[PDB]
Design a protein around this nucleic acid. Structure first.
Lengths: 130, 200, 263, 142, 195
RNA sequence: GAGAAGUCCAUUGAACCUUAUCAUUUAGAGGAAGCAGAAGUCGUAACAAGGUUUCCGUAGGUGAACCUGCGGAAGGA
RNA sequence: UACCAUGGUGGUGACGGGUGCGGAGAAUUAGGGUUCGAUUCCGGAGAGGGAGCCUGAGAAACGGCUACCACAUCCAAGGAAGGCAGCAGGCGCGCAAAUUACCCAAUCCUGACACGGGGAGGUAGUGACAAUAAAUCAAUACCGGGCGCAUAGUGUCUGGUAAUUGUUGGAGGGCAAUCUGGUGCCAGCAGCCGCGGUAAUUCCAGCUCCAAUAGCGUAUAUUUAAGUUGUUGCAGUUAAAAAGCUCGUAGUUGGACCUUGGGCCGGGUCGGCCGGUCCGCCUCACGGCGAGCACCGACCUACUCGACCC
RNA sequence: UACCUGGUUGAUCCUGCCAGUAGUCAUAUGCUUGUCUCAAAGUUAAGCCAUGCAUGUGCAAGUAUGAACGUGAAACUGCGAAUGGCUCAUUAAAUCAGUUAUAGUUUGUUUGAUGGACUCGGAUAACCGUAGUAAUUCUAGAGCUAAUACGUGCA
């Protein structure tokens, strides 16, 4: 299959762990998710070490919070890509109440729900980062 | 149809089963002729026409799409625009150019494709002008939600099987396109029919 | 009732805010608990880099360190000791001395009830439960009752006689009480499903409710709460799940608001 | 869950299965039966009751027009029924009592209770007290 | 039928005295049971207003109440109307009040704000005072009447809708005994036993 | 020049009887004892290491509950 | 229909069997689905069963024939004679559904040249089978009780009397509502539970209590609840449940990086009848009906851009 | 709003179902209906049918007209009786829906197009006069008569 879930699980598990950061292997779609996470300030930053020739890559993703509570109160997959459970621009069923965001690989790219909504695009939800 | 539309002008009260008398009183004309006929159909651009101390009306569409009468000037009453709905091609240069009202014309006159319109008087059954379906000309839209609006053609897109959409510049507000069937040409630089308030 | 919701800003995010404020701290994460140990170690390295030791005690230092050992002392909180809750309710008064202590004139298992103030107390229900012994099988009773002030915490207690159980029960709910932040005129802050065992206990913000969690709804000071609690009509469990909801709220604003620490 | 929701050639398989497993009742109902059925009976008998306790209700067996013979319970106190008559049956369910799949509800010839009040449309009589029963008996005779 | 709900409403209002507790459901229900009762209108009916109220978008509680100025309600704030289900209510059926210059005579319609309620000239001058006066006078008379009378259920004065009942003088005794012997054997039940 | 009653060949191509069989409603040759009511007899299996630890595939066989041979299991000492 | 070729189809369900019209739509339920598919609108089909034909622009014809069969009918009994699943109405089947009525005034249509016709259709009679609003009480004075004041007496509401003014369901629990009389596991009752084995909270009567109230419950059908067909919305270790396990396919899915197309997506513009549903306005005293206006509709068809991922 | 509560039990929690409760139909039992006002109105037999009746027009479609008094009217010819109505038996099907195809094809009448006042004869119903299986239904031996229905000459 797809990685996707591992990345997600790794993050929340990490938060509970109070781990400084986590690492794993990555793509454009799972860099893409990571970037959205950074954009909406879920994580401090992410890096993809060794990215040019070696057989693999990895991605050092740094978690945000440290202390008290953790930023990622809850993150869950719903349904990955290739796909079906599919939403429309308008169909957008959801969680939070706009507190959180839902990473949606849209048509356009992987963007957040709000952008896609604007973007006038539907796509396939990745997960509901809260 | 002629009955429905004259009957539409009435809708205050008290005809319909009595209907028959209006026609008999020979006070109704369609395109400058006598018809007294209960099953008669009429359609867009027909000119319909009342007494004696009387008036003239043009069949038009309202913004939704039903056919309704509108008061028309005597000057305008003289003319009618006929859309070329189909063609059986040929002779010499004659297509048999069918028009929307159901009129035949065989032959020249200098042009001519479907969606072009012919400006015709009434008495003689003479063709004054041809209004080409092309960019820069003005059109009125015959049906739909989009109905009852006018615009200038910005561009036409042609595809396989049929010429799909006609794009309009216009609006007092903004741009819109419709399929060709919808488009009825009403004006060119040389000759317009347009003097009727406006519009999205 | 409705729906996301909107307006206004700060006003709106007020109420229970303080319990929110402190409380954000005290669960998770490295500060707070969860277990907090090595996370201490990881903590020690930062703080030094920051405030800085001035290196023979002197003036400055003596203060600073005790300004550190207080986030640490605070960190301990596992939300069964008053802190966050306390400051909100009021307070001052002789009575306050007695509660922090130690048994002065009063307090043995008591003394928080006076302080909170007026409020309705209604019996939810009383139930049986029959437990079989050598000579004869001894009828008991277990009564679940709520007076609640403005937070939420349900109580089940029993006694071999019907009347004594409730009296002590009334204290029992008011002490060890946790304030969910409502956010609207009796509306939940964000949708949460809380579950213990095989009960599927979801709440979302729509209309009125029915049964066991309806009388609970009224007493937390909710007025529109659409609670689909399904997997048992067994009433003792139904209230119990719902209490775990109404104390560990964990809406976004909770996650973001954290920056600050207190004496 | 198995697949959940994908594409390439695949929804159809567990549409098939669900119909097949189906508990409740298929193809509406009649292996006896339903609808208002008027069985004319000539068996008055008494039958026993379900595993929990005893009694002995008075019952009347009836053979249905739609070809079945079963035992039906009669509700209300007291009763009489005669030449045939035609007593109309609701066919309500107990969820069970032995051999007693239906009961005959009050209907035409099926009478109601000794002149009362209390009540009168469960356990049932006539105008004020009685008046209906007197007329009722007459019908079948002539 | 109307007397009875008003009596219950009054009972709920007052106090101390005898009684135990309640349950779950009963709390939600009982409240619903008061607010309809002021209006002295039916339950099909509060709920039908309630349903249009649930259906209009806005803050749920308020709209039902907030859109309780209904022609009946309104008269009550204006204080011309003695109680809602008043003699004035009956006056609304009499056609005495106007809305938009036009008449209606159902109480049930829902008034919106900035509507004018005035009486009407014609209806001031009542048809059936004249007739009452008429006897006196130059004739006969004989009084009055409220009633509590009847006619059916059945004189005494405590009577009808509603009720009094009476039908007194049973004796049921025998009839049960007449169903205890009768309902007995035969008719049971083919038991062949012998000890 | 039209062409009535009309008679024949060919074709589409009705209804009774000829099949032979399948289906439905039915009854039914003769027959087996699956569940059940409580008001029965037989033994006392299982139920506590149930007085021979239970259960199980498998065949044999016993009034029967069942027994046991073989091998397996611990939901068993 | 000749001749030549022997085929074409189906593990993505062909061929076949059963089914107590298809769509527009109805009912639900917060959404999803479930359900329902019909009388009406629309298309198709058949007129006792079945084939064929003339006529006419159009019929393979309910109000035409031919004519086998099925079945009533007429008979001066030789021979003819019929089409109600068209209205009204009969018959019997069944749980059960209307006057052997009135009119073309409206509405639309056949006819044709100008007023004629219609069981299309409308009326009224029947009729609580969907709907709603109003009664019957009710407003008010005065004696008697409680609450706001303060033995009493004031201010206010009830339990009756005096003046004028326009029924049915249940009451142990579910589930809301503790008498008295009579019976005693007998009789009967409760759709589960359970009640009666003599002072019954459950029978039955009568008082009283009350839910709802010109309606009500009861049954049938159906759906929600019931996440109990689970897509949203569940299990398979001991609860129904993990295939003894493998070798392998058709069938679900797919690690990284660059680039090209573009089936999966935005805008569209067509159609999405009316009725119904929702908003709001008036019209018959009101309302529901009905009128007029507005707002929403999946999805599916043109066109162009667009590429992250399959 | 929707949400649940009773029963496995000494008592408990979980699995799980029965049952109440909620809404609803083109329906029945029905006790009970003072009221205005609109509405459903045989998924049983596509069983079988008595009685009246469900299609008509000449003041410019057509020449003529016994009988009735230019006015009405019976037959022939033209337009119509196929529209409409109602029932889902048949019925899972290019049957129907939605989109296209159709120069691969029809459209009379009509709306519209294209073509275009010499002389004429022919027989016929009604009306009649009687009739056969004959009470018959039915139609003919039969006198008489009219055709923008017919047949022609034709720039």
């Amino acid at each position: 299959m797809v990685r996707v879930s591992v990345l997600n699980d790794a993050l929340k598990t990490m938060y509970n762990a109070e781990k400084r950061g986590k690492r794993q292997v990555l793509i454009r779609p799972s860099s893409k998710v990571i970037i959205k996470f950074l954009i909406v300030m879920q994580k401090h930053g992410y890096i993809g070490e060794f990215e040019f020739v070696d057989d693999h890559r990895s991605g050092k993703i740094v978690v945000e919070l440290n202390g008290r509570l953790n930023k990622c109160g809850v993150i869950s997959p719903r349904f990955d890509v290739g796909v079906k459970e599919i939403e429309s621009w308008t169909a957008r069923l959801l969680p939070s109440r706009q507190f959180g965001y839902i990473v949606l690989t849209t048509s356009a790219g992987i963007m957040d729900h709000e952008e896609a909504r604007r973007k006038n695009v539907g796509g396939k939800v990745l997960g509901f980062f809260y | 149809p002629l009955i429905l539309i004259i009957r539409n002008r009435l809708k205050y009260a008290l005809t319909y089963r009595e209907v028959i008398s209006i026609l008999m009183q020979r006070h109704v004309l369609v395109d400058g002729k006598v018809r007294t006929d209960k099953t008669y159909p009429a359609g867009f651009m027909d000119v319909i026409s009342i007494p004696k101390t009387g008036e003239n009306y043009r069949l038009l569409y309202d913004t939704k799409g039903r056919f309704r009468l509108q008061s028309v000037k005597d000057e305008d009453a003289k003319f009618k625009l006929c859309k070329v709905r189909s063609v059986q091609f040929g002779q010499k240069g004659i297509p048999y150019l069918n028009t929307y009202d159901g009129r035949t014309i065989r032959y020249p006159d200098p042009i001519i494709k479907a969606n072009d319109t012919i400006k015709i008087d009434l008495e003689t059954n003479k063709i004054v002008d041809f209004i080409k379906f092309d960019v820069g000309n003005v059109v009125m839209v015959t049906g739909g939600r989009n109905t009852g609006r006018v615009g200038v053609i910005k561009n036409r897109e042609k595809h396989k099987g049929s010429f799909e959409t006609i794009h309009v510049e216009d609006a007092l507000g903004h741009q819109f396109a419709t399929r060709l069937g919808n488009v009825f040409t009403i004006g060119k630089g040389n000759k317009p029919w347009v003097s009727l308030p406006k519009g999205k | 009732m409705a729906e996301r919701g909107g307006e206004r800003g700060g006003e709106r995010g007020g109420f229970g805010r303080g319990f929110g404020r402190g409380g954000r701290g005290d669960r998770g994460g490295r500060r707070g608990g969860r277990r907090g140990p090595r996370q201490e170690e990881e903590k020690w390295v930062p703080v030094t880099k920051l405030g800085r030791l001035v290196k023979e005690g002197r003036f400055s230092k003596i203060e600073e360190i005790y300004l550190h050992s207080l986030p640490v002392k605070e960190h301990q909180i596992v939300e069964t000791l008053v802190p966050g809750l306390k400051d909100e309710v009021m307070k001052i008064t002789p009575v306050q001395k007695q509660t922090r202590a130690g048994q002065r004139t009063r307090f043995k298992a008591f003394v928080v009830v006076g302080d909170n103030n007026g409020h309705v107390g209604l019996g939810v229900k009383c139930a049986k439960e029959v437990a079989t012994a050598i000579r004869g099988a001894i009828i008991l009773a277990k009564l679940s009752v709520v007076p609640v002030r403005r937070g939420y915490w349900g109580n089940k207690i029993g006694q071999p006689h019907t009347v004594p159980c409730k009296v002590t029960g009334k204290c029992g709910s008011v002490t060890v009480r946790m304030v969910p932040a409502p956010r609207g005129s009796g509306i939940v802050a964000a949708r949460v499903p809380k579950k213990v065992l095989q009960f599927a206990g979801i709440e979302d913000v729509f209309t009125s409710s029915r049964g066991s969690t309806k009388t609970l709804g009224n007493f937390v000071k909710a007025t529109f709460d659409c609670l689909m609690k399904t997997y048992g009509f067994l009433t003792p469990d139904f209230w119990r799940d719902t209490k775990f909801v109404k104390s560990p709220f964990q809406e976004y604003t909770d996650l973001l608001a954290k920056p600050t620490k207190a004496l | 869950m198995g697949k959940t929701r994908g594409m390439g050639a695949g929804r159809k398989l567990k549409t098939h299965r669900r119909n097949q497993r189906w508990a409740d009742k298929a193809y509406k109902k009649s292996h006896l039966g339903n609808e208002w059925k008027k069985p004319f009976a000539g068996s008055s008998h008494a039958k026993g009751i379900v595993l929990e306790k005893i009694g002995i209700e008075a019952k009347q067996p009836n053979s249905a027009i739609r070809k079945c013979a079963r035992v039906q319970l009669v509700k209300n106190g007291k009763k009489i029924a005669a030449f045939v008559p035609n007593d109309g049956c609701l066919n309500f369910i107990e969820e069970n009592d032995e051999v007693l799949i239906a009961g005959f509800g009050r209907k035409g010839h099926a009478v109601g209770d000794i002149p009362g009040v209390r009540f009168k449309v469960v356990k049932v009589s006539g105008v004020s007290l009685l008046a209906l029963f007197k007329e009722k008996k007459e019908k079948p005779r002539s | 039928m109307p007397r009875a709900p008003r009596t219950y409403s009054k009972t709920y209002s007052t106090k101390k005295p005898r009684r135990p507790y309640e349950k779950e459901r009963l709390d939600a229900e009982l409240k619903l049971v008061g607010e309809y009762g002021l209006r002295c209108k039916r339950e099909l009916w509060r709920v039908q207003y309630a349903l249009s109220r649930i259906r209009n978008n806005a803050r749920h509680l308020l709209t039902l109440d907030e859109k309780n100025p209904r022609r009946i309600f309104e008269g009550e704030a204006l204080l011309r109307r003695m109680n809602r289900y008043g003699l004035l209510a009956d006056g609304q059926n009499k056609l005495d009040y106007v809305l938009a210059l036009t008449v209606e005579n159902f109480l049930a319609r829902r008034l919106q704000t900035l509507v004018f309620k005035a009486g009407m000239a014609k209806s001031i001058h009542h048809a059936r005072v004249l007739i009452r006066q008429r006897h006196i006078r130059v004739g006969r008379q004989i009084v009055n009447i409220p009633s509590f009378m009847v006619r059916v259920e059945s004189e005494k004065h405590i009577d009808f809708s509603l009720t009094s009942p009476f039908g007194g003088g049973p004796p049921g005794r025998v009839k049960r005994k007449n169903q205890k012997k009768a309902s007995g054997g035969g008719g049971d039940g083919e038991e062949e036993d012998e000890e």
